[PDB]
Structure prediction request, 479 residues.
Amino acid sequence: RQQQRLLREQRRALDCSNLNLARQQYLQKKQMNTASSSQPTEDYFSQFNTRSR
Amino acid sequence: MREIVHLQAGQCGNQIGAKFWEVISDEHGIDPTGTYHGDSDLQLERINVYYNEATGGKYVPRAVLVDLEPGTMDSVRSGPFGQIFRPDNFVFGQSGAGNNWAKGHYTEGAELVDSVLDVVRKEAESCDCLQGFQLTHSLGGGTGSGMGTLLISKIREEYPDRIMNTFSVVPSPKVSDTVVEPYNATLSVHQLVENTDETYCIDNEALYDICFRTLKLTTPTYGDLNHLVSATMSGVTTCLRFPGQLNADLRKLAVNMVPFPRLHFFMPGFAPLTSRGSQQYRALTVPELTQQMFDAKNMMAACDPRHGRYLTVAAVFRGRMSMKEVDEQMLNVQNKNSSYFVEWIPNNVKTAVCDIPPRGLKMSATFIGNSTAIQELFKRISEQFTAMFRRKAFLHWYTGEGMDEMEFTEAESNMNDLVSEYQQYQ
Prediction:
């Protein structure tokens, strides 16, 4: 009976561990999603004004 | 250790070469006097591909500057970046070529080709493993097309196994500014076909067509066409200088592109071109580069690839991206339409990915397509060469330099075979 209680406790501890792992992975992908898609600054616009030929 | 020696000739050559070196220097953090003022460290890691070394942290480019008059060498030295070029690298005559092919090729250029060949042999013997050369010239001129095909014939007999790349500006007949332009262009394509490993065909009409339509510039100028050419001249060499997840140098892009040795005329295109007004309406992703990379209103040649069949296709990406979204869009464009893609090649598209994006953008791309629809550029030159030549229109300017009429005859039949070498795959 005590070994069955120990098995239940070990499963609960592992479940809390990957719960906290799930939270930090959610924050990791939430700052992953904002860093791919691109926007052009004024440095992309300023070169097409220069040059008069 | 994979150096590239840059050569350019003519007013068209030295006005693209002046703007190209403005783009590389910004991308490696070089000031207008030659001192490194960057912020990261990967800019300084492989600077020797394009730049030499001097005293006190001064990087002078490996570029050679050729003209037949001193009138366009002074607008190079009086620009913003004119003080970074080594003064010995300017090689210039005293009387011009006069929009004549033969003076560039026999009379005035033959006494000058042995002075440039001293300069390029000084710099090719200072590289540990020279990757190849480049040219940037004009076929509608006298020293770009006459002497520029005399260096190519003389370089390829001395360094024959390297890469000989060109960015030729072929003439356009809708916006044409020289009467004797069909004579220069016909006599040069006969010389490009056997002596270049690659050749990118650029038309000035198809560069005006982008600034009016895509970039919405109300005043396009030659200083703004030279930035479209220079942006795709550095997009093909971006994996020799920066690390990536799938590299591609110049030789790898020629293995997967030319199936037969005489079929090497490409058509460039640059992906994220955006106006000032329509800037905020676009979320630039991998799907929104491959819709503009492949569009027929984007090609830098005045020929439509909806009339032909893509033999092979390149794609060179920049920016930190995902290799699955890049790879599913190249498969997607092949499978929707199988009339425009040839059948004896089962996968036509070659992909490469770099990591360091250009200045001011966070993602970019480059298209290098090998189309059968480039034959409508040589046929349209050759209907105006033989409209003139049956009457012998302007021929006394050329035969009086020491030519023959057979040189016009042999360089007309040999270019009409390149039409009928492409004509058997469409």
User: Anything to note?
Assistant: The helical segments of chain A are 2-32. The interface with chain B takes residues 36-45, 47-48, 50-53 of chain A (CB under 8 Å).
